[PDB]
Amino acid sequence: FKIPDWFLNRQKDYKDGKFSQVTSNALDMKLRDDLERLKKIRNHRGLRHYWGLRVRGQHTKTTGRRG
Amino acid sequence: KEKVNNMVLFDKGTYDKLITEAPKYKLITPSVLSDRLRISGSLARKAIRELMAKGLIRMVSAHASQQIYTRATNT
Amino acid sequence: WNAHPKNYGPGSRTCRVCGNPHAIIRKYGLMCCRQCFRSNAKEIGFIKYR
Amino acid sequence: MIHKIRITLSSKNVKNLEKVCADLVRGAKDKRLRVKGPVRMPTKVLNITTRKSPCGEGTNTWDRFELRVHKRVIDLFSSPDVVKQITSITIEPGVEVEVTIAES
Amino acid sequence: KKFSYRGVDLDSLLDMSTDELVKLYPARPRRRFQRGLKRKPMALIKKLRKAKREAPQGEKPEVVRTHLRNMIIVPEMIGSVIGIYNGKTFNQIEVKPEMISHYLAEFSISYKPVKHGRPGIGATHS
RNA sequence: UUGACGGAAGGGCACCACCAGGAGUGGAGCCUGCGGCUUAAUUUGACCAACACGGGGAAACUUACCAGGUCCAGACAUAGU
RNA sequence: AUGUAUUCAACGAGCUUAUAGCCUUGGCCGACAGGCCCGGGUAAUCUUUGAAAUUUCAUCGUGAUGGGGAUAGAUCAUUGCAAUUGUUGGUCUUCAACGAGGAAUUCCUAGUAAGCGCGAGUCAUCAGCUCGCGUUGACUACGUCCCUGCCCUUUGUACACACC
RNA sequence: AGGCUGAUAACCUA
Numbered sequence: 160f161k162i163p164d165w166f167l168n169r170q171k172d173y174k175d176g177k178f179s180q181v182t183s184n185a186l187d188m189k190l191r192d193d194l195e196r197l198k199k200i201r202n203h204r205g206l207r208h209y210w211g212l213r214v215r216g217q218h219t220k221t222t223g224r225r226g
Numbered sequence: 227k228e229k230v231n232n233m234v235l236f237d238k239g240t241y242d243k244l245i246t247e248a249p250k251y252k253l254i255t256p257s258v259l260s261d262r263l264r265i266s267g268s269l270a271r272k273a274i275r276e277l278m279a280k281g282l283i284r285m286v287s288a289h290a291s292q293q294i295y296t297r298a299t300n301t
Numbered sequence: 302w303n304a305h306p307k308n309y310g311p312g313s314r315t316c317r318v319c320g321n322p323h324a325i326i327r328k329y330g331l332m333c334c335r336q337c338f339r340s341n342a343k344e345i346g347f348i349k350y351r
Numbered sequence: 352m353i354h355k356i357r358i359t360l361s362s363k364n365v366k367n368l369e370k371v372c373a374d375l376v377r378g379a380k381d382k383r384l385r386v387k388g389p390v391r392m393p394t395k396v397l398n399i400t401t402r403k404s405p406c407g408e409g410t411n412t413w414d415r416f417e418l419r420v421h422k423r424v425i426d427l428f429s430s431p432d433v434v435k436q437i438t439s440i441t442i443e444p445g446v447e448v449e450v451t452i453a454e455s
Numbered sequence: 456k457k458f459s460y461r462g463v464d465l466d467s468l469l470d471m472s473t474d475e476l477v478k479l480y481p482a483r484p485r486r487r488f489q490r491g492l493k494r495k496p497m498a499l500i501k502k503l504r505k506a507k508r509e510a511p512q513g514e515k516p517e518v519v520r521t522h523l524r525n526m527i528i529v530p531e532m533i534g535s536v537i538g539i540y541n542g543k544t545f546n547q548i549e550v551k552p553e554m555i556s557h558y559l560a561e562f563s564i565s566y567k568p569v570k571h572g573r574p575g576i577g578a579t580h581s
Numbered sequence: 582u583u584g585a586c587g588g589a590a591g592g593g594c595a596c597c598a599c600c601a602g603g604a605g606u607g608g609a610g611c612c613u614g615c616g617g618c619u620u621a622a623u624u625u626g627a628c629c630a631a632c633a634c635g636g637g638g639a640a641a642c643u644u645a646c647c648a649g650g651u652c653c654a655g656a657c658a659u660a661g662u
Numbered sequence: 663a664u665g666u667a668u669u670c671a672a673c674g675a676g677c678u679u680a681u682a683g684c685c686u687u688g689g690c691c692g693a694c695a696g697g698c699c700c701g702g703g704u705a706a707u708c709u710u711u712g713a714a715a716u717u718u719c720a721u722c723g724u725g726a727u728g729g730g731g732a733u734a735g736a737u738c739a740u741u742g743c744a745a746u747u748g749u750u751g752g753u754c755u756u757c758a759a760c761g762a763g764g765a766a767u768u769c770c771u772a773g774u775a776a777g778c779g780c781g782a783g784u785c786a787u788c789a790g791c792u793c794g795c796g797u798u799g800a801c802u803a804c805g806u807c808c809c810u811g812c813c814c815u816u817u818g819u820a821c822a823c824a825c826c
Numbered sequence: 827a828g829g830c831u832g833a834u835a836a837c838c839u840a
């Protein structure tokens with residue numbers, strides 16, 4: 160339908176390289192595969208996902224206290 | 227605190243009530259109709275336009291935030 | 302020796318009077334730290350009116 | 352033969368600046384030259400605001416330092432040599448005289 | 456279920472040119488290579504693949520230690536053993552195909568994860 | 582005797598006091614500073630009149646901290662090889 | 663709130679010209695971010711023909727909802743020698759608490775409070791900060807010593823490190 | 827745990 164590539168929530172997929180709009184469970188599976196890939200290679204971002212910590216460089220001393 | 231259940235489209239019963247009772251109101255606004263007829267404000271805005279087209283109600287004030295209408299003929 | 306680039310950032314600039322790198326006033330090309338400027342303000346021509 | 356010569360004066364001292372401007376206008380009115388000015392440009396107020404304390408302790412008080420620059424522009428309709436004669440007079444300290452041939 | 460990067464299989468990634476590879480990488484690695492590489496990154500790549508040539512057939516290559524933790528992992532580095540300095544120690548890793556386009560810094564954590572002890576005096580009544 | 586102090590008195594005064602009020606803050610998420618905890622190190626000063634303060638918004642430098650490698654940028658004078 | 667239409671400030675700041683290091687108009691390319699080209703300005707000369715709240719019309723309709731935008735995925739560009747422990751800026755997606763806040767407590771008497779944005783400092787890049795600027799523009803009081811303190815007098819004192 | 831106090835006790839809140 161000529162919707163451009165920059166308008167999609169899955170641009171240049173890691174495995175296939177394709178552009179698509181992923182919805183519902185396919186979107187949930189995509190998020191699961193992103194984190195499993197990072198955790199599998201013991202990537203720093205993957206490890207902080209596994210530990211339940213913030214991953215985008217935020218200070219953690221004072222905010223996000225919910226435990 | 228209960229939730230209002232305002233209908234988004236008229237049913238035959240409520241639409242007939244609008245055509246008969248609403249023309250007799252002294253003050254007609256989207257919120258007045260929305261509360262009396264249990265209709266959403268969005269449906270009330272369209273309903274007021276229909277009453278204007280039918281000539282059943284006349285306009286008193288027009289503002290994007292507040293619209294004021296009244297019965298075309300008094301009593 | 303001194304290989305690291307010194308083209309920008311606090312490490313490149315220092316106070317012209319004292320050589321300290323902190324609180325430099327770069328406005329108008331003064332290049333003085335805030336402490337040295339206050340000491341020399343009257344001589345430079347700056348004055349307090351209100 | 353007759354050219355519009357622009358003279359620009361700058362100073363921090365108003366009285367000295369106004370004194371030199373009067374000496375030039377009055378010095379040109381003696382030669383019956385046409386004079387445009389002095390035109391007073393808006394005052395430039397350089398401003399440095401700085402913490403008074405050399406450390407960070409105490410109430411945070413600030414010093415507002417101001418250095419005002421006053422600028423005057425005088426246009427003389429005459430030849431460069433005549434203007435060079437008028438401006439050659441000794442000028443008061445701190446007044447910066449700048450003579451240019453107006454590009455018109 | 457072989458590894459593929461952007462649809463390209465691992466076999467083709469090795470034989471691809473650098474110009475072709477940068478189109479597969481995300482924006483940050485592409486800018487890094489477009490701005491060029493300095494002397495130090497080049498030397499590490501020279502040593503990493505030199506260690507592979509010295510490796511007896513069927514054995515992993517010897518460790519190569521480096522301080523370059525802003526180095527980007529490229530397909531040529533797959534299978535290398537690298538000791539990445541974290542500021543104190545060289546943490547050894549084996550480069551895997553899923554590490555492509557990541558920084559070496561991302562695999563050598565510079566801090567110890569926090570395991571909290573009991574609050575000390577002065578932690579409350581604040 | 583002078584001061585300071587008083588749940589002593591008298592007179593006067595202040596939105597860093599109150600009154601009449603407005604906006605709030607304190608509750609939520611987040612930003613940032615401080616403590617504590619953790620750490621190779623998480624440099625440090627400061628506790629009304631410390632705590633978006635040290636103009637302190639630190640990727641390098643800054644940088645004082647930690648793990649390592651260099652360099653002499655040891656004048657001058659005396660003796661020695 | 664969102665989407666249109668509409669429309670009015672002040673303080674200020676700005677370059678080594680090297681192809682060009684600062685503020686940048688105009689033209690072109692691009693959805694955006696951004697890029698290319700011709701230039702202006704060392705400045706009441708050029709940027710500066712220079713804001714937002716607000717005004718206006720429409721949509722939404724009392725539903726954590728088109729309120730809120732934290733957290734998170736993918737991807738693009740820019741600054742830099744270097745961006746990972748996301749520098750920042752974009753695009754789509756994700757869409758948490760929070761329904762006005764307990765004890766307690768701050769500031770403020772008129773172009774003030776509050777709301778609204780702008781410049782400057784820091785600055786290669788980065789503002790929720792600070793210092794200024796204007797725009798919109800109130801309620802209440804014109805008192806008192808009740809609380810917290812202060813000044814003067816008289817008075818008591820076993821205090822003088824001075825009621826901690 | 828917070829608040830009140832220069833601080834502790836007392837007191838108040840959660």
Ligand SMILES: [K+]
Binds near residue numbers: 220224
């Ligand atoms: K936290």
Ligand SMILES: [K+]
Binds near residue numbers: 606
């Ligand atoms: K509040």
Ligand SMILES: [K+]
Binds near residue numbers: 634
């Ligand atoms: K402060």
Ligand SMILES: [K+]
Binds near residue numbers: 731
């Ligand atoms: K968001």
Ligand SMILES: [Mg+2]
Binds near residue numbers: 216217218
């Ligand atoms: Mg961070």
Ligand SMILES: [Mg+2]
């Ligand atoms: Mg008063």
Ligand SMILES: [Mg+2]
């Ligand atoms: Mg108070």
Ligand SMILES: [Mg+2]
């Ligand atoms: Mg009150």
Ligand SMILES: [Mg+2]
């Ligand atoms: Mg608020």
Ligand SMILES: [Mg+2]
């Ligand atoms: Mg709190």
Ligand SMILES: [Mg+2]
């Ligand atoms: Mg709060």
Ligand SMILES: [Mg+2]
């Ligand atoms: Mg005081």
Ligand SMILES: [Mg+2]
């Ligand atoms: Mg450092």
Ligand SMILES: [Mg+2]
């Ligand atoms: Mg260092």
Ligand SMILES: [Mg+2]
């Ligand atoms: Mg919204």
Ligand SMILES: [Mg+2]
């Ligand atoms: Mg205007």
